[PDB]
Amino acid sequence: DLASLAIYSFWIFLAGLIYYLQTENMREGYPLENEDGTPAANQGPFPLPKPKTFILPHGRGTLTVPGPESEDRPIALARTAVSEGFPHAPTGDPMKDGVGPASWVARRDLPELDGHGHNKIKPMKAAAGFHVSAGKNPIGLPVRGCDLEIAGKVVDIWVDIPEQMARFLEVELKDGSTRLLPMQMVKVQSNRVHVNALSSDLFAGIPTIKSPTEVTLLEEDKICGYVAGGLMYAAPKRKSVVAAMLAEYA
């Protein structure tokens, strides 16, 4: 063509591509809301778009997104600063009202579905696919919490197929009332486990999975969020915790 032409169909057709792209990343989350439930300051120079129709993978409805954004779930932060900016603090203990570092959400009562007609995440006593029948095999060992004391005993694995993976490590209590705990934080070396998140006397505060085989998408929010609750506060202030929570490497 010429020496001065083509750089202009670009300073224009793309000079609004940070503009068109940003809104497409500003679907979820927006609109902006204040610290109570209020049409907030604004949105930005790239305001949120009015959503298109969303078809769901296993007939879960006309869930358009951005979707539910209001105040369905319970929140409990005592507003320290009524002015918008300065943070807020929970009522009693922050690991009971569910506010701060430990987050969850209320969803519909249909768990994540694949395509076989069955659910996603099941234990090893819900899939006789791979077993134990050679030598001595380790699925059943004692554990330890962040308080540096024994916490329970894990003797099972929640299996995966499409990813061939794992998501939880189930703990047999003295009783049997169900409990749960994430997968990536873990740091196991020899013959005993060490978790560095929650103390060994705060594991019952983790909800019993309504079913020991099923994880509904409603439940999969606090169950992998309570450990994040103990990654912020824990732990004031003096002595052993200073030689436990800090330092380290990995």
Partner: protein
């Protein structure tokens, strides 16, 4: 069905007479022969 309608047959009917129209106008102006909007002195 087929493709988007309340999405694709309207807001994309612009680049039909924009991106196409612009990079065809650009050439027929910068040509030594055309100009047309340059002839005045005579």
């Amino acid at each position: 069905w087929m493709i988007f309608d309340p999405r694709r047959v309207f807001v994309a009917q612009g680049v039909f007479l924009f991106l196409l129209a612009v990079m065809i106008h650009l050439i027929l102006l910068s040509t030594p022969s055309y100009n047309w909007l340059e002839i005045s002195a005579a």
